[PDB]
Amino acid sequence: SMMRWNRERRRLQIEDFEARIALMPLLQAEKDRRVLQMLRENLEEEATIMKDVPGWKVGESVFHTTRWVTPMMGELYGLRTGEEILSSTYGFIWYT
Amino acid sequence: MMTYIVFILSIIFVMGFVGFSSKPSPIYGGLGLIVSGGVGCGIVLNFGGSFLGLMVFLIYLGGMMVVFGYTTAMATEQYNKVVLGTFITGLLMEFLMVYYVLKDKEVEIVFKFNGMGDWVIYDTGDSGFFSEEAMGIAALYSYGTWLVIVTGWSLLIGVVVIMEITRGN
Amino acid sequence: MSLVYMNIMMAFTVSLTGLLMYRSHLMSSLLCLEGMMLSLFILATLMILNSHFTLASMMPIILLVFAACEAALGLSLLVMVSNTYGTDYVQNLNLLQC
Amino acid sequence: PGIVELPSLEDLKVQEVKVSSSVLKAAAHHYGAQCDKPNKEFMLCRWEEKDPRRCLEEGKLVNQCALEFFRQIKRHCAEPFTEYWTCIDYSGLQLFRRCRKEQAQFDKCVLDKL
Amino acid sequence: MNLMITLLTNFTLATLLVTIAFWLPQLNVYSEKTSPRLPFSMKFFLVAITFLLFDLEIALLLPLPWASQTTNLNTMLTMALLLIFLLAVSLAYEWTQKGLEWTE
Amino acid sequence: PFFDVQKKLGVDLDHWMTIQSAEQPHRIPARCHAFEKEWIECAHGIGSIRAEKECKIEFEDFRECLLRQKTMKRLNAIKRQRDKLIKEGKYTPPPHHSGQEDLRP
Amino acid sequence: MFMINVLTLIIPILLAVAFLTLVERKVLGYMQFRKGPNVVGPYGLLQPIADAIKLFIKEPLRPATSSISMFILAPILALTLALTMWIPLPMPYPLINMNLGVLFMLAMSSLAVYSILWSGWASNSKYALIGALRAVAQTISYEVTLAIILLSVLLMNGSFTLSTLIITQEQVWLIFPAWPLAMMWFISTLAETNRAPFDLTEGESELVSGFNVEYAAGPFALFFMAEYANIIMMNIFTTTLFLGAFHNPYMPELYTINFTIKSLLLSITFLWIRASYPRFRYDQLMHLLWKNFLPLTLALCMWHVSLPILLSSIPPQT
Amino acid sequence: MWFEVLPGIAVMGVCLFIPGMATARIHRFSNGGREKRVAHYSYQWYLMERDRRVSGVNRYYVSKGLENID
Amino acid sequence: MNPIILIIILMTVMLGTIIVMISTHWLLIWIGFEMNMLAIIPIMMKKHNPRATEASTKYFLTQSTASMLLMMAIIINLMFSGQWTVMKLFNPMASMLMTMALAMKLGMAPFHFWVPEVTQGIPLSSGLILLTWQKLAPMSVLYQILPSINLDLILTLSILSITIGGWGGLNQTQLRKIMAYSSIAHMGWMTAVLLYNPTMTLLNLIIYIIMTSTMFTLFMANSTTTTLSLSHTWNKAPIMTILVLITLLSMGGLPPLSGFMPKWMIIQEMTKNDSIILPTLMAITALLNLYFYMRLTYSTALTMFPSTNNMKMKWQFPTTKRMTLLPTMTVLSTMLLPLTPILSILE
Amino acid sequence: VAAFLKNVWAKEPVLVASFAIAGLAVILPTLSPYTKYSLMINRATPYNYPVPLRDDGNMPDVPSHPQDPQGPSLEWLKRL
Numbered sequence A: 001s002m003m004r005w006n007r008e009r010r011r012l013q014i015e016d017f018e019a020r021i022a023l024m025p026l027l028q029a030e031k032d033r034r035v036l037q038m039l040r041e042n043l044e045e046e047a048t049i050m051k052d053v054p055g056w057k058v059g060e061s062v063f064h065t066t067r068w069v070t071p072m073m074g075e076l077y078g079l080r081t082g083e084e085i086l087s088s089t090y091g092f093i094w095y096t
Numbered sequence B: 001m002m003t004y005i006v007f008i009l010s011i012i013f014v015m016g017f018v019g020f021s022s023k024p025s026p027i028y029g030g031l032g033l034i035v036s037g038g039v040g041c042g043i044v045l046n047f048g049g050s051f052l053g054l055m056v057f058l059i060y061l062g063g064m065m066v067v068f069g070y071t072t073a074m075a076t077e078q079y080n081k082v083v084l085g086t087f088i089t090g091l092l093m094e095f096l097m098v099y100y101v102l103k104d105k106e107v108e109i110v111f112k113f114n115g116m117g118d119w120v121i122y123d124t125g126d127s128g129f130f131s132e133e134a135m136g137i138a139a140l141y142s143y144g145t146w147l148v149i150v151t152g153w154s155l156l157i158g159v160v161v162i163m164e165i166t167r168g169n
Numbered sequence C: 001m002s003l004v005y006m007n008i009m010m011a012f013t014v015s016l017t018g019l020l021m022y023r024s025h026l027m028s029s030l031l032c033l034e035g036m037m038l039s040l041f042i043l044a045t046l047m048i049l050n051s052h053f054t055l056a057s058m059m060p061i062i063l064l065v066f067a068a069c070e071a072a073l074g075l076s077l078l079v080m081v082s083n084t085y086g087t088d089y090v091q092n093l094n095l096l097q098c
Numbered sequence D: 001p002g003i004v005e006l007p008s009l010e011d012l013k014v015q016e017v018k019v020s021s022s023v024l025k026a027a028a029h030h031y032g033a034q035c036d037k038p039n040k041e042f043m044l045c046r047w048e049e050k051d052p053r054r055c056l057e058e059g060k061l062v063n064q065c066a067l068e069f070f071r072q073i074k075r076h077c078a079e080p081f082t083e084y085w086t087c088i089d090y091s092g093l094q095l096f097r098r099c100r101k102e103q104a105q106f107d108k109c110v111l112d113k114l
Numbered sequence E: 001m002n003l004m005i006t007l008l009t010n011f012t013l014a015t016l017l018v019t020i021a022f023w024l025p026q027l028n029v030y031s032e033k034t035s036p037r038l039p040f041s042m043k044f045f046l047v048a049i050t051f052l053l054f055d056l057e058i059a060l061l062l063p064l065p066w067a068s069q070t071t072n073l074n075t076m077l078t079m080a081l082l083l084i085f086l087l088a089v090s091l092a093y094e095w096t097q098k099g100l101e102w103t104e
Numbered sequence F: 001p002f003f004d005v006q007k008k009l010g011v012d013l014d015h016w017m018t019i020q021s022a023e024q025p026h027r028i029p030a031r032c033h034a035f036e037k038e039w040i041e042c043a044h045g046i047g048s049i050r051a052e053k054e055c056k057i058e059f060e061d062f063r064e065c066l067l068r069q070k071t072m073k074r075l076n077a078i079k080r081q082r083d084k085l086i087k088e089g090k091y092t093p094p095p096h097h098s099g100q101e102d103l104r105p
Numbered sequence G: 001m002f003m004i005n006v007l008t009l010i011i012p013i014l015l016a017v018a019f020l021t022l023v024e025r026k027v028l029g030y031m032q033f034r035k036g037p038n039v040v041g042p043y044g045l046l047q048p049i050a051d052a053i054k055l056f057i058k059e060p061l062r063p064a065t066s067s068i069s070m071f072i073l074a075p076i077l078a079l080t081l082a083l084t085m086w087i088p089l090p091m092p093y094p095l096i097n098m099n100l101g102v103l104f105m106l107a108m109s110s111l112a113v114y115s116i117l118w119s120g121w122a123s124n125s126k127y128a129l130i131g132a133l134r135a136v137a138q139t140i141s142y143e144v145t146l147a148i149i150l151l152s153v154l155l156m157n158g159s160f161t162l163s164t165l166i167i168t169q170e171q172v173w174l175i176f177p178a179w180p181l182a183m184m185w186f187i188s189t190l191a192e193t194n195r196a197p198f199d200l201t202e203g204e205s206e207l208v209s210g211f212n213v214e215y216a217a218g219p220f221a222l223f224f225m226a227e228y229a230n231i232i233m234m235n236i237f238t239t240t241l242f243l244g245a246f247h248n249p250y251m252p253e254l255y256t257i258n259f260t261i262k263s264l265l266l267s268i269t270f271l272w273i274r275a276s277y278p279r280f281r282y283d284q285l286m287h288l289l290w291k292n293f294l295p296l297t298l299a300l301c302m303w304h305v306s307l308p309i310l311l312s313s314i315p316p317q318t
Numbered sequence H: 001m002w003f004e005v006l007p008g009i010a011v012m013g014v015c016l017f018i019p020g021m022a023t024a025r026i027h028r029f030s031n032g033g034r035e036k037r038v039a040h041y042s043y044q045w046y047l048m049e050r051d052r053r054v055s056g057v058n059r060y061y062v063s064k065g066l067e068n069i070d
Numbered sequence I: 001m002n003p004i005i006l007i008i009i010l011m012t013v014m015l016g017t018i019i020v021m022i023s024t025h026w027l028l029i030w031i032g033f034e035m036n037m038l039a040i041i042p043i044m045m046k047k048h049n050p051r052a053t054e055a056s057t058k059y060f061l062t063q064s065t066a067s068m069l070l071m072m073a074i075i076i077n078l079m080f081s082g083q084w085t086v087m088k089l090f091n092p093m094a095s096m097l098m099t100m101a102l103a104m105k106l107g108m109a110p111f112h113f114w115v116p117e118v119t120q121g122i123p124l125s126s127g128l129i130l131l132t133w134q135k136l137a138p139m140s141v142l143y144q145i146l147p148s149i150n151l152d153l154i155l156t157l158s159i160l161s162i163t164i165g166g167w168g169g170l171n172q173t174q175l176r177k178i179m180a181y182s183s184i185a186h187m188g189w190m191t192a193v194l195l196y197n198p199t200m201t202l203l204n205l206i207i208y209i210i211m212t213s214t215m216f217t218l219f220m221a222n223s224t225t226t227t228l229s230l231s232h233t234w235n236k237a238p239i240m241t242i243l244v245l246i247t248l249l250s251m252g253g254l255p256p257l258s259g260f261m262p263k264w265m266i267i268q269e270m271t272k273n274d275s276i277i278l279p280t281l282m283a284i285t286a287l288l289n290l291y292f293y294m295r296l297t298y299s300t301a302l303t304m305f306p307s308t309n310n311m312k313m314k315w316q317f318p319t320t321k322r323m324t325l326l327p328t329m330t331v332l333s334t335m336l337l338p339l340t341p342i343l344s345i346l347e
Numbered sequence J: 001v002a003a004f005l006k007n008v009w010a011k012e013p014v015l016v017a018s019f020a021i022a023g024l025a026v027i028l029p030t031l032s033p034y035t036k037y038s039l040m041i042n043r044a045t046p047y048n049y050p051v052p053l054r055d056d057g058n059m060p061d062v063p064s065h066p067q068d069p070q071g072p073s074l075e076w077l078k079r080l
């Protein structure tokens, strides 16, 4: 009985994973536009905050490379409120 | 305040270490190490080490500190200045470090330390339908073959060694 | 670097200076030794989870297993010392001065 | 070092797929059957460029073909799809295995009318 | 978060029960009552150490329900049976060298 | 006495946990996979002496990926200047940095 | 709204612990050819209330304690662990749905021996400490087979998730593929909660339970109700683990009725075991663990590792 | 006779029935008449946070179907 | 002890040493040190008297503290390098902590305070294992991490070890403490030349292990643990006095013997790097080692101390001890200086 | 060997069941015909994303669409 039913559970797991795979291009496109939205917002507010500061390059990379670096949590949610910070950075861990 | 939860648990962790390391008695030192192990487990749990934190509770506090309290109960007797003085010494050193790294967002004792909440350094992506921590621990059986061999050999030898040196002959 | 690493390393040094300054009991020394192990466990775990370094997730478990077997060895040494001298005092272990 | 180059907020404007995850998971098999080519162009561009700034046009083509997919569902089979994603949506794990008759009705209407 | 709220609630209810059970029987003023190392066993310490070492072997065994999902199944099954066999060999050496005696 | 028995016999006893850029279970990338791969493929074969002075940029990018010291220092500078401008009243925070804009997806 | 759910977990736990004393005294009455309480309430229903009010206004006994702090913390820890063992229990929905509920319960039950150890420290008698160390060695002995039986069963589940264990048993009770694990599980949980025939503290084979001994002990009601919370919890956990019921996701009350009836039958089975056998001697239950249960548990652990591989029945992770 | 134990068993059974029935009704009240979303894995949490962002009311359990697209 | 269990435990000691010597991962280095200590603890408690329990407890505390400092150095390395290869260390704090941990494992001064106590507390065979085989694995790790070893730290440890191991043996009459302070001085000699040429470090370690194995094997074959019990050897086996004479003259660094070879090669490789004061002070400090060696030769071979009457009964019995490789080790510890360019096989 | 087996089954049947269950667990997966399918099912479970290939011109076995005939199939798993 456990043989038949765990084989059925594996086939159901494959069906769930194929649904996930079929949705991953759309979610990746939305995630890319999401992070570029948040980085552009942080860049514009860095341009309007860091005017009085002498010798400040706005949008200066901390890396010598010109390769795209995956953004950090503090790079995205740095200027936002503490509730959005907590819901993005401890939300899955603190979920139930 | 709530974005600093791992930091506040780490302050409780250092306070517990100053507690038992000032050594009042092995009974209360065991109690302080139990409370310290619990809050350091909470530190691990707030990064996503759920299995490793339950390894802290189940193995560290669950077996080993139970054996420490057991062996203490067979070696101490049930019924100071230096302990309380060293306690408040370590507490003042820790709170002065907290005050510096909070008012300055920067300190340097041995290394340079940020003063913001350690939420900043996390990843912004998902792991899909697994835990990366669980799959890396699960790879002890497919990738950690030599590691399993030397760990099991050390534990078997450890059983042999404890039966040798407690035999008295 | 990150703020929690300061507290975990300072916890290691607090349990170090506890372990490097005995009062009377060998059990309190072993408690400081396993507090050193506990701080090493937490520090390695925070690095490995922060880095998403997948295969080193089994590293703190191997650390925990080896050092708890080490702790069992130390408790058996303390037990043999206590069956020799009646207590676990480190001032009873002074026969090897001469 | 150098200045990071980001696209403007005009270049990040697209008509989003503002549906829920059970609506997507209910439609996911036909979405993977029908919206294959822009999705795989995007994922190939995404694993080769290793940069989401070189993949924004393929992301917009994905986000456009998904909308064409759901409009083509909405013109023919809105009610079996709605019943089916409501049944998917009840479950906390969103099981496919709890919803086989609504899946059968949605697949029947989708195979007939599309 | 909800876990922390639940732990705080269980700790609070437990502390409230303990505080009631110590202070509620102090309401009735009672007649103030005025009338009026432990031996070591090696086997008690040895059963605790045997527990600790087999518990570490169990700590090695705990990632098995995740380890069966691997693509290197022959190596995984070999090392799984090898850890359970080394636990059994530790038990056999504990058996045959009189270690499980008078607490058998 | 590094008796390199592993390279002699061809066995892989511990090279798999050695770096982050190695083969991982289910192909999970480390968060600094590219930086470590660049530093290793730079420093490969040329020895430690040439690697410390010729691959310095790749190793600095990789250390700053790992520890994120320059990133946190930059965010500290921006956040301190932001809080000074808020206290001086010369700056207002936008609605998209206060939770008032109905987020993207 | 969540605190309402926490309280409707933890207050009916205490009420069920209250009436388990009545169910115990009645069912042990009728098995002993007598009645249980029927005078204090109608059919004895006021006996837990009267007995609790009696215990809460009774004097702290005679003596003083060696350590005040552990004398306070041992009932706090006992009740706190006895209440936190219930929050991942899927009945059909856990209060705290976690991915590692099994390992959580195993770890929090491993933490429960500190109450016994600290109550042995907090007593002044050096003989009560010896009895506490015997009890600690018993409980940590049977935690080994708890861990390994639990691992062997979870190899058919796929994860440490307790809610998945309802899905695993949708075609058959899990006692059918794992009845030797189930019976060694049941006897090992019996030996966990210091329950007869393994109750050496509350009985003889004990150096300190010997009539006009010393040892200031805690208020008995708190450790007693922690122990009965643990008894009902380990029987609910055995019910989830081996006798998992039918769950309709649109009617959760069917699963709640079904697991409740099975958990009541299994707790009455604890009551019916304690009224049927004499007690083990201490080395006899050490024998029963170390020479009898642990070899079969390691052999069946090898069997339940290698068996989904040879039958192609490896359960999914998710 | 032996049916005298059934009132105590019945009271204890009602006391065990209350927690599970309670958490099922509270999960259906707090989540729009449906089961509580189970997010054990970070993909499930990602989809759940996406639902919370697309619902427009900061609630994941407000489902948006084909009426939300043109 | 069961001979099967003895053989398995010695194979586990050797296994921990080999795991340190072959592995490319820091966790396996730490695992090898843990396995090594865990297996050598019963060898120290072979006879079950309170001095062996005290010696094993002191050894446990020192090697446990060093293993935890080693893991802290490894963890700081994982911070500042993101990897685990056993090579140079990418932080001076990790390098300092690892050099301290290996200095504690070797018993170099000022972490030397366990070595004469632990060596006195244990038998001669376990003292032989402690002073020869237990030096192999930390010198292998120091051989591998030397691009990051601080020079001032390792030379401070080296000269302090040579000086304290010189002055420590001058007050001793117990043979095991003399060998332990000899160990401290020779470990100073090994680590002084490490950053200059580690091939000469391996040469010093090999010649040291040969000579110390010769002295412990002679002390086992004569069953002598004190100076004054070694003094009766002329009336029991006069060839043994000759062998301990030439081996103590070798360990003092006198030509034409092979104990002159390591210190002459160390001075030879330290003057190349424009260090003159330091090998000269090291060479002059080794005269203290030669002084208490000559004290032992005076008490054993060059004079005849008074014996007792019961030695006449021991005249009637031969040595039935397995004096394993004692002629081979005696020849290699004395007559190897004409083969001094054999050291290139360790390059 | 038949006298010893009945004697150890009379004196220590727990150990006989222990060694029998352990010996079956060792030697049985190498004799079972379904041990192949465990490997086949674990390597067919799609955890990651099937990152597509750039169509260079000569890949006749790789499909262009998931519903194309060529490619790896799981009909053995649907049927068994």
Ligand SMILES: CCCCCCCCCCCCCCCCCC(=O)OC[C@H](COP(=O)([O-])OCC[N+](C)(C)C)OC(=O)CCCCCCCCCCCCCCCCC
Pocket: G175, G180, G182, G183, G184, G186, G187, G197, G238, G242, G273, G277, G288, G291, G292, G293, G296, J011, J012, J013, J014, J016, J017, J020, J021
């Ligand atoms: C989950 C719901 C409940 C589950 C069932 C439990 C309800 C019944 C409870 C009854 C009351 C029990 C009270 C406590 C009793 C404690 C004493 C006791 O029983 O000790 C156990 C006794 C102890 O032995 P003993 O003391 O009786 O015998 C003497 C022992 N020596 C010789 C060592 C001195 O037996 C066991 O340990 C058995 C454990 C479980 C056995 C599982 C059998 C598996 C068989 C597989 C096949 C075997 C055939 C051969 C191989 C074939 C391969 C194909």
Ligand SMILES: CCCCCCCCCCCCCCCCCC(=O)OC[C@H](COP(=O)(O)OCCN)OC(=O)CCCCCCCCCCCCCCCCC
Pocket: G015, G041, G042, G045, G046, G049, H011, H014, H015
């Ligand atoms: C989840 C379910 C949990 C269930 C928990 C409770 C289980 C048991 C349920 C109750 C069963 C019946 C109880 C009857 C008790 C006795 C009532 C009574 O009449 O007692 C008589 C006594 C004296 O009366 P007197 O005036 O002297 O009469 C002389 C007549 N000429 O009169 C008195 O003493 C005064 C009246 C006392 C009445 C007490 C009734 C029981 C109270 C129990 C507390 C809990 C209540 C329920 C809470 C949960 C549900 C909301």
Ligand SMILES: CCCCCCCCCCCCCCCCCC(=O)OC[C@H](COP(=O)(O)OCCN)OC(=O)CCCCCCCCCCCCCCCCC
Pocket: A092, A093, A094, A095, A096, B034, B035, B036, B037, B038, B039, B041, B042, B043, B045, B046, B050, B051, B053, B054, E001, E003, E004, E007, E011, G073, G076, G077, G080, G081, G084, G097, G098, G099, G100, G101, G104, H039, H040, H041
């Ligand atoms: C003598 C002192 C007083 C004694 C009485 C009181 C203390 C003893 C009883 C309390 C014990 C507390 C145990 C709490 C942690 C248990 C492990 C855990 O968090 O597991 C639940 C879950 C793991 O499941 P998973 O689904 O993987 O993670 C969520 C991601 N979806 O993970 C989560 O849900 C993570 C949630 C966030 C992290 C929670 C951290 C809790 C707070 C820190 C520890 C508090 C306890 C410290 C003291 C312990 C005992 C000394």
Ligand SMILES: CCCCCCCCCCCCCCCCCC(=O)OC[C@H](COP(=O)(O)OCCN)OC(=O)CCCCCCCCCCCCCCCCC
Pocket: F001, I010, I125, I126, I128, I129, I132, I133, I136, I202, I206, I209, I210, I213, I217, I220, I322, I323, I324, I325, I329
């Ligand atoms: C880069 C370097 C890589 C590695 C290169 C190789 C390094 C070699 C290091 C050698 C260390 C040897 C340590 C001692 C041997 C270990 C086992 C042992 O203890 O054997 C002695 C044995 C024990 O018997 P037992 O009865 O317990 O002793 C009491 C006396 N009845 O029996 C006795 O006690 C009997 C008395 C005689 C014992 C003599 C043993 C001599 C062994 C060493 C030979 C010399 C080393 C090899 C050649 C040089 C290599 C560099």
Ligand SMILES: CCCCCCCCCCCCCCCCCC(=O)OC[C@H](COP(=O)(O)OCCN)OC(=O)CCCCCCCCCCCCCCCCC
Pocket: E085, E088, E089, E091, E092, E095, E096, G295, G296, G298, G299, J008, J012, J015, J016, J017, J018, J019, J020, J022, J023, J026
């Ligand atoms: C090959 C597969 C893998 C095998 C390894 C895995 C094993 C899993 C089970 C773990 C067992 C752990 C404990 C083992 C201890 C063995 C030693 C032992 O118990 O010997 C003592 C015993 C007599 O018992 P006694 O000492 O008197 O006990 C006190 C009460 N009288 O002596 C005896 O009763 C005799 C014991 C030896 C003979 C047992 C024969 C059993 C045969 C079963 C069928 C064949 C199974 C295949 C394995 C080969 C067996 C020869």
